[PDB]
Amino acid sequence: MTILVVTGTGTGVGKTVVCAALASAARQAGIDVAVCKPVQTGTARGDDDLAEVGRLAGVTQLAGLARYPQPMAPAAAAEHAGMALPARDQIVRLIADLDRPGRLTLVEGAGGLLVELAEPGVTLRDVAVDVAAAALVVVTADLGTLNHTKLTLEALAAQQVSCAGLVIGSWPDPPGLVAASNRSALARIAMVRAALPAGAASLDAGDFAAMSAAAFDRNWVAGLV
Amino acid sequence: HMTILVVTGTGTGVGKTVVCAALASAARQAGIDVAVCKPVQTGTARGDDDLAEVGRLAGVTQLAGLARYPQPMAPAAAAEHAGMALPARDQIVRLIADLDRPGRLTLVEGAGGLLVELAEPGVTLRDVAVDVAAAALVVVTADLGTLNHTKLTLEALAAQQVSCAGLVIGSWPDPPGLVAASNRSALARIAMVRAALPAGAASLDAGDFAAMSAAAFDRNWVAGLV
Amino acid sequence: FQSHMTILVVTGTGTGVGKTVVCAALASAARQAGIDVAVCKPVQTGTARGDDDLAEVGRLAGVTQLAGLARYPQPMAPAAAAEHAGMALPARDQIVRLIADLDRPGRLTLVEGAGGLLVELAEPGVTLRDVAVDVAAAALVVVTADLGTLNHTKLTLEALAAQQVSCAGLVIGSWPDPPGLVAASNRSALARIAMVRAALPAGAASLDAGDFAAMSAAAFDRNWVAGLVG
Amino acid sequence: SHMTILVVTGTGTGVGKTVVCAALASAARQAGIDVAVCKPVQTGTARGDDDLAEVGRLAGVTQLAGLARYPQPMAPAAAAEHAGMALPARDQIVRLIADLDRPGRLTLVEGAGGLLVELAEPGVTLRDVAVDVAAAALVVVTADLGTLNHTKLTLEALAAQQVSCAGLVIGSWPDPPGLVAASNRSALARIAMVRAALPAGAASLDAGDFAAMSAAAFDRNWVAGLVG
Numbered sequence: 001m002t003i004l005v006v007t008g009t010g011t012g013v014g015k016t017v018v019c020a021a022l023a024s025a026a027r028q029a030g031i032d033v034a035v036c037k038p039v040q041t042g043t044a045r046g047d048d049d050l051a052e053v054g055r056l057a058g059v060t061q062l063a064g065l066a067r068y069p070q071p072m073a074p075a076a077a078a079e080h081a082g083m084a085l086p087a088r089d090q091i092v093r094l095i096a097d098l099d100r101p102g103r104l105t106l107v108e109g110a111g112g113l114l115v116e117l118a119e120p121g122v123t124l125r126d127v128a129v130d131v132a133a134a135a136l137v138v139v140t141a142d143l144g145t146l147n148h149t150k151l152t153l154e155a156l157a158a159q160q161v162s163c164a165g166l167v168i169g170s171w172p173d174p175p176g177l178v179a180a181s182n183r184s185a186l187a188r189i190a191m192v193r194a195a196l197p198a199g200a201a202s203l204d205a206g207d208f209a210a211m212s213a214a215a216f217d218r219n220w221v222a223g224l225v
Numbered sequence: 226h227m228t229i230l231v232v233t234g235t236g237t238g239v240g241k242t243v244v245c246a247a248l249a250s251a252a253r254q255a256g257i258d259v260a261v262c263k264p265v266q267t268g269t270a271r272g273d274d275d276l277a278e279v280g281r282l283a284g285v286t287q288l289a290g291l292a293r294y295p296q297p298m299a300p301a302a303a304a305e306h307a308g309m310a311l312p313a314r315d316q317i318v319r320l321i322a323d324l325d326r327p328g329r330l331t332l333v334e335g336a337g338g339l340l341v342e343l344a345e346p347g348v349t350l351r352d353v354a355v356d357v358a359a360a361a362l363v364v365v366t367a368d369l370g371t372l373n374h375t376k377l378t379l380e381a382l383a384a385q386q387v388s389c390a391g392l393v394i395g396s397w398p399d400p401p402g403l404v405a406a407s408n409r410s411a412l413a414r415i416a417m418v419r420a421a422l423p424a425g426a427a428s429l430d431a432g433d434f435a436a437m438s439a440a441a442f443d444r445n446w447v448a449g450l451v
Numbered sequence: 452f453q454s455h456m457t458i459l460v461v462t463g464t465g466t467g468v469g470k471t472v473v474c475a476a477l478a479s480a481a482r483q484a485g486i487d488v489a490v491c492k493p494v495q496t497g498t499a500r501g502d503d504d505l506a507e508v509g510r511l512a513g514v515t516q517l518a519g520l521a522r523y524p525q526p527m528a529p530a531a532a533a534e535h536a537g538m539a540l541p542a543r544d545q546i547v548r549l550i551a552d553l554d555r556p557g558r559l560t561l562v563e564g565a566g567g568l569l570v571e572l573a574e575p576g577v578t579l580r581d582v583a584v585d586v587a588a589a590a591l592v593v594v595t596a597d598l599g600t601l602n603h604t605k606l607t608l609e610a611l612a613a614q615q616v617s618c619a620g621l622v623i624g625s626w627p628d629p630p631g632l633v634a635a636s637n638r639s640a641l642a643r644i645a646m647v648r649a650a651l652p653a654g655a656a657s658l659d660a661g662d663f664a665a666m667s668a669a670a671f672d673r674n675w676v677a678g679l680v681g
Numbered sequence: 682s683h684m685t686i687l688v689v690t691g692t693g694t695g696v697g698k699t700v701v702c703a704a705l706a707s708a709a710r711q712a713g714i715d716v717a718v719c720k721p722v723q724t725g726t727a728r729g730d731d732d733l734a735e736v737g738r739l740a741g742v743t744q745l746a747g748l749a750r751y752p753q754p755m756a757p758a759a760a761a762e763h764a765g766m767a768l769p770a771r772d773q774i775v776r777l778i779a780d781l782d783r784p785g786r787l788t789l790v791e792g793a794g795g796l797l798v799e800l801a802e803p804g805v806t807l808r809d810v811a812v813d814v815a816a817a818a819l820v821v822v823t824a825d826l827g828t829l830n831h832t833k834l835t836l837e838a839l840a841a842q843q844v845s846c847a848g849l850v851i852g853s854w855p856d857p858p859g860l861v862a863a864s865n866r867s868a869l870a871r872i873a874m875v876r877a878a879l880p881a882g883a884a885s886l887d888a889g890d891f892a893a894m895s896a897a898a899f900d901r902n903w904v905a906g907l908v909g
């Protein structure tokens with residue numbers, strides 16, 4: 001089994017693009033890639049993180065269980081619809097079924113690590129434990145990332161989930177004073193696996209793929225499977 | 226014990242997706258929990274997304290899928306163009322068996338008609354229904370040619386002892402015409418017609434869709450499904 | 452030395468798929484190999500709209516040995532076209548006899564269905580597939596290259612096999628120029644489930660007798676056509 | 682120590698830690714409690730920031746104790762680096778706090794940013810200081826999207842070092858709360874006690890109105906019992 005949960009320090013942090021960028025680099029090295037997003041909120045607004053990964057990295061095994069119209073935490077969205085979340089069992093078997101020899105499976109949750117994905121109080125962290133996934137955590141390069149990062153790293157270490165490293169979801173065009181010290185700081189805390197250019201999400205499939213193959217150590221990511 | 230309905234059709238573009246939405250809505254209004262699974266979806270560059278359709282029309286949130294292909298082709302063809310295999314038989318059967326729970330109606334939509342390959346190796350919605358002991362609902366047109374495609378699909382169900390839950394006419398013309406009205410009578414002679422959905426139902430808003438759907442099915446038959 | 456005719460029931464995945472133009476083209480390819488050809492249309496509907504598949508074949512292939520039986524004015528399924536006209540459907544026996552009367556050694560006889568395989572041609576629920584069992588015909592099935600073709604053809608093949616009516620192969624009734632991606636992958640997929648005997652160019656039904664004749668000779672494998680009757 | 686000491690942390694910078702110190706200081710004062718407020722590490726002076734100064738202005742407290750002050754509104758380590766300065770020593774922060782020691786006193790200690798922000802070398806945080814001085818922790822949160830994750834993360838970092846949690850406070854509550862805000866409050870009250878939710882705009886009130894808002898914001902029995 002070769003599963004990696006892609007969590008992050010919160011929502012709107014670059015987890016989806018990182019999913020796409022890793023997917024579209026694992027491919028370039030001839031790795032088969034599936035992406036799972038069990039619970040997707042904000043559909044009335046057009047949120048579809050699976051589609052975005054399909055467009056950007058071309059992945060095709062794109063799996064999901066539940067979608068809620070309202071753009072809030074899954075449990076909030078669920079209850080503003082009057083309809084439960086999936087069960088831990090649905091989410092765990094779904095992911096585990098996705099796994100193939102030679103295949104990288106990426107799981108994006110919703111928001112940060114301890115967001116409730118299933119009933120009762122089940123998180124991406126419980127999922128990772130049950131599928132023996134390592135975790136890749138996506139972080140901003142902005143004010144607050146160090147605290148949010150350390151706080152996520154500890155919460156992972158507390159259930160003995162491996163961090164496979166960090167990825168800056170957006171790295172500034174003019175690279176900034178805060179951002180630069182933040183990167184030096186993060187780098188001393190953990191292995192920073194990639195830093196994605198700031199506009200990577202709005203590139204075209206060829207752009208993105210040259211971007212992605214440049215973003216990651218071909219050696220670390222081939223060694224994932 | 227399981228309450229899954231496979232929702233199949235005589236082909237692609239006959240109303241399977243709108244029928245799942247209408248059945249789901251009618252079931253929801255009867256107080257039944259509904260899950261909809263579409264394991265494989267093609268045409269994601271056309272912008273095709275049936276689960277999204279079902280969500281908007283019927284408000285179902287338990288919407289499960291496994292794969293999505295950009296090219297508007299049969300799943301196996303889409304897969305081959307992309308260089309990326311289809312899901313696996315047991316992947317589909319377990320997804321579906323996991324969705325299922327007591328009092329819940331789980332609906333499964335395939336890609337195109339009954340015999341389209343959805344999984345490897347050479348697996349169809351019919352094979353899946355066998356594995357899961359699901360009856361199949363058959364969506365038909367009202368147009369010239371429906372009797373043959375319909376009879377042909379009903380024989381394929383019977384060949385593997387998958388039950389027919391009945392037919393639904395996915396789009397009913399206004400005004401009908403001589404063919405449609407004749408086909409409607411002729412369809413009713415070979416199978417129970419659970420509903421005939423009015424043409425253009427797919428463009429209705431959720432509130433309009435709900436009222437149409439409550440009226441399209443017999444609540445007793447829907448309630449009985451569970 | 453075949454002492455009786457070879458009968459092919461030419462069915463389709465539906466109506467409008469090119470059955471008639473395929474009969475016409477095979478009749479033509481076979482006449483050019485020295486085989487005498489009869490074409491039979493036991494149930495013709497839509498005659499009040501000018502539908503006449505037998506006349507179409509004579510126009511295109513010059514075939515003159517043309518056998519019909521039932522003609523209903525309304526363009527609908529046989530059973531409904533008959534009811535509308537206050538007529539009845541013919542009997543199974545009348546159909547089989549229409550066919551058996553055409554018998555000569557080494558003749559190729561083509562029987563064009565109305566619509567696809569399981570259309571009711573005689574009461575009660577008698578189809579072209581039961582006719583084929585009665586006259587020991589192999590089936591030639593006409594398919595499109597369009598979306599939906601693989602399901603419809605697999606459906607048609609499986610129903611044939613259920614009564615042990617053997618398959619003589621597939622014919623694409625209209626083949627586009629050039630083919631897009633769906634068409635090209637449909638043809639490859641179709642060639643994995645069965646022998647694809649030919650793929651008539653889009654607009655074949657529209658050629659001159661002389662053009663149509665050239666087309667039909669190029670369309671089929673001559674060794675297949677030649678072995679049809681011996 | 683003879684004092685009771687509460688560290689006031691948050692899910693980040695800009696959540697209302699300062700105005701919650703102000704508000705609790707004003708509520709504690711009105712209950713007859715001697716209050717001191719302490720800010721060991723202050724950044725952002727270039728922008729105009731003085732959290733100690735702001736507390737005096739809002740609440741009227743005069744026992745304010747500060748130590749390190751940096752110009753740039755960056756994390757303390759980066760702020761100090763940019764200024765060519767050091768971070769304070771650990772025993773310094775602890776001294777600053779101990780020296781406020783008086784029987785009967787409520788001492789509030791505001792962190793810089795969130796809980797795991799480095800205040801002293803090497804990676805000494807408000808959490809480590811809380812243990813040093815036997816302080817419970819008050820957690821200031823937003824009612825915005827992302828709050829549930831950030832507070833659970835914080836709550837569990839406290840428990841991991843057996844730092845007692847004195848409760849949550851929402852730093853800014855919108856009168857007419859949207860759907861998310863209302864949902865977020867109900868969910869926060871499930872995982873811990875919400876001691877107060879300060880009206881949005883609390884920090885631009887005059888002293889008299891700020892005192893009356895503060896006495897209303899908190900349960901006076903809880904406040905009075907912090908020095909118990």
Ligand SMILES: C[C@@H]1NC(=O)N[C@@H]1CCCCCC(=O)O
Nearest residue numbers: 370371372373466496497528566
């Ligand atoms: C010859 C008639 N004219 C026409 O265009 N099609 C009719 C014959 C097709 C019958 C198809 C019946 C069905 O399967 O529904």
Ligand SMILES: C[C@@H]1NC(=O)N[C@@H]1CCCCCC(=O)O
Nearest residue numbers: 237267299336337599600601602
């Ligand atoms: C679901 C997919 N969307 C679409 O446009 N057609 C596909 C349906 C499958 C049809 C397969 C074509 C055939 O059977 O030949």
Ligand SMILES: C[C@@H]1NC(=O)N[C@@H]1CCCCCC(=O)O
Nearest residue numbers: 011041042073111827828829830
């Ligand atoms: C996916 C939904 N769309 C969106 O804009 N954010 C939601 C996800 C984030 C949930 C954060 C819950 C919390 O931590 O409070």
Ligand SMILES: [Mg+2]
Nearest residue numbers: 015016049108
């Ligand atoms: Mg995302």
Ligand SMILES: [Mg+2]
Nearest residue numbers: 241242243275
């Ligand atoms: Mg559909």
Ligand SMILES: [Mg+2]
Nearest residue numbers: 470471472504
């Ligand atoms: Mg014809």
Ligand SMILES: [Mg+2]
Nearest residue numbers: 698699732791
């Ligand atoms: Mg402050």
